[model samples]
Target: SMEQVAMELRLTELTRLLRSVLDQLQDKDPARIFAQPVSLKEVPDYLDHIKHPMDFATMRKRLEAQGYKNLHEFEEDFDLIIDNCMKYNARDTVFYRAAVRLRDQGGVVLRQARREVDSIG
Candidate 1:
């Protein structure tokens, strides 16, 4: 009935909010490093060091599949992407610096998304 109508509307907004936040992450990754899963061929030891690896492509696929029913689920995955980068790379490398950028920018975008969703509640 119409009682559930508000839920449907909220979900519609939720999906868009997730996509927009993801796009923000993509823009920060001009080299497309975070666009897909870590290449086993390129970084054979990546999995060895990072237990939980995440990237934009994986997150988008999960989003499209409605796997992120909870916004925090998506938020954690974004953190994983940032976490793994800094974990695997050295303090002075490009990848580590990139992670800091993601962490910083992520704070802005993720908070914006959360605040918007919070207001709709």
Candidate 2:
């Protein structure tokens, strides 16, 4: 168990290193957009969407073509989903499933998106 934890930590550090190298290779400006403005408040409950699994890889590739390559893309989408859910005042299992789908795919997209966003800014 402890070895696994160490491996994970090392892998995470390696990923960060790769991201840094990419950022430098691109020679991107960071002063304009590298601020950590949002704080993630963790939800305490078990998100129900985890129960209904979907083909995240397939969905990700499909969405990628449309320019939604990460969580931030879904962040904007979440506003709409929440608004619609509240409007009809109806509960839907599908929304949760979709959110989970985005979450899984967004993990990879978010990293690349962050790099691009930072580079541009």
Candidate 3:
């Protein structure tokens, strides 16, 4: 009903505001390694340098838990997740193409993995 639509919009805006707050907190932390040249396309290579890459399984579960209703929501959240990871791991880069690949390919790869798993069980 129209009522639910209004609530959903409110939730979406609330989520964005919360995310902004979190970003600000991270930025101000003294120990935090702030990112440079942190464009969306540069995130993948930045991620690769992590002594431990973020566990794909963990990320999958986290995303699933969020109950994103559409790709746009998922992508926005994913961008933030990647950005946070990059900031923490934000110490170095090259193989710039690898970064580009991740930005373009990561979502499709995970979505396919989910499809495959659901088909199996």
Candidate 4:
């Protein structure tokens, strides 16, 4: 059971990698970006809508055709992918509001817990 879940996680990671590569190509030219998922906000849902590795492979090729060297070079393009995520999340009003509340309260909780634990010793 664990192995099956682990394998699925690996596949999910690979699919995310494919999506990242596709996103990086968007930086070079808007036309290079695929029609399927137009923005970073749509990526995880897009990958879920797809069924096979072949679909992802086809997209990888499309990026190469647009100027990316090869699948191997995608690792080097990860920063662009992450930057896109940050931009998307930053612009998302819901995410920004939730992030502020989550972070501010999270810090307070962490500090209070630390003080309690320190007093225990």
Off by over 4 Å in 1: 1-9
Model 3 C-alpha lDDT per residue in residues 78-109, reported as the tens digit of each score: 45545545445423543333333344555555
Alpha-carbon lDDT of model 2:
0.39
| Candidate 4 accuracy as lDDT | 0.42
**Candidate 1 residue lDDT tens string, 8-54:** 66776787788888898778877676778889899898778999889
Q: Which residue ranges in model 2 land beyond 4 Å of their true spot?
A: 1-74, 77-92
Overall lDDT per candidate, in order of appearance: 0.82, 0.39, 0.45, 0.42
Evaluation by TM-score, superior candidate among 2 and 4: 4
Error of 1 at 46 (Å): 2.0
As a whole number from 0 to 100, the lDDT of residue 28 in candidate 2 is 27
Top model by TM-score, which number?
A: 1
* TM-scores of the candidates in the order shown: 0.87, 0.26, 0.30, 0.28
Per-residue lDDT of model 4, residues 1-121, tens digit only: 9998876665555455445544444333333222233333746663454332222234556544443333344433433333333344555565334434433443444354435334632
lDDT of 1: 0.82
Expressed as tens digits, the lDDT of each residue in 1-120 for candidate 2 is 999887666555544443443334222212211112111254223133222222223223434344343335434543333333333223466544443444454446546756755564
Instruction: State in Å the error of residue 19, model 4.
Output: 34
**Alpha-carbon RMSD, each predicted model:** 2.0, 14.7, 12.7, 16.2
